[PDB]
């Protein structure tokens, strides 16, 4: 399966915008079937974004209208956050599910720490 490639951490500016990269090289046989982004919520995680066969779903009021996950370049499922909040400092998980020719599904994920600085 494709390696999910992410930086270890990303730093953005308070009230600015930032991208958290999550990219894999497409690989013959492996069809992407689900993408999720999750954020830590105390001692577990919660979904903040899902892309599936019916498109993108961002259903929390705190996120709807300010998250964009890349969609035009195969393998690029990077998350961009509009107007960073100090409380956006957190660990974010990029999670991708692929299907193989035999119908097997492989799921991989990666945790990226997001830091938020008050000024540039």
């Amino acid at each position, epitope marked *: 399966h494709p390696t999910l490639k992410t930086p270890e951490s990303v730093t953005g500016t308070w009230k600015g915008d930032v991208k958290i990269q999550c990219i894999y090289d497409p690989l013959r046989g492996y069809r992407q079937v689900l993408v999720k982004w999750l954020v830590r919520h105390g001692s577990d995680s919660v979904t903040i974004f899902l892309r599936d066969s019916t498109g993108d779903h961002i259903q929390q009021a705190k996120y709807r209208g300010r998250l964009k996950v890349s969609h035009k370049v195969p393998g690029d499922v990077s998350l961009q956050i509009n107007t960073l909040q100090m409380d956006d400092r957190n660990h974010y998980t990029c*999670e991708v599910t692929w299907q193989t020719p035999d119908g097997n599904q492989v799921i991989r994920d990666k945790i990226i720490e997001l830091r938020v600085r008050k000024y540039n």
Partner: nanobody
Amino acid sequence: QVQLVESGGGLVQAGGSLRLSCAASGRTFSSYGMGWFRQAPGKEREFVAAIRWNGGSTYYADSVKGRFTISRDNAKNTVYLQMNSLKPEDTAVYYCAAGRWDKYGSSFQDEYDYWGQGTQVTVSS
């Protein structure tokens, strides 16, 4: 660059129990899923057990299911492997590893970034 150091290895009799630990350096321990792997003489390195960043999900190789339990203390930057009902075939060098997987892939060595030097465990009979 996180450094990992295993402790607690040694000689134990078959049927006995042994507790390994692994200390991680730094202030970002909770950024990592942690795992134990082992490598016996002549054999390739294989998965033993893993534990999610939160200490709340664990994963085991079929070879050690039930007998071995992995745990972590994020306040101490430490992961533990409690090995019960030991068998001579559990003899190996045991390696601690850290990676940025969350819930998935923990049985695969390529999902880990950093490795300890390993500690010898010998189970005699």
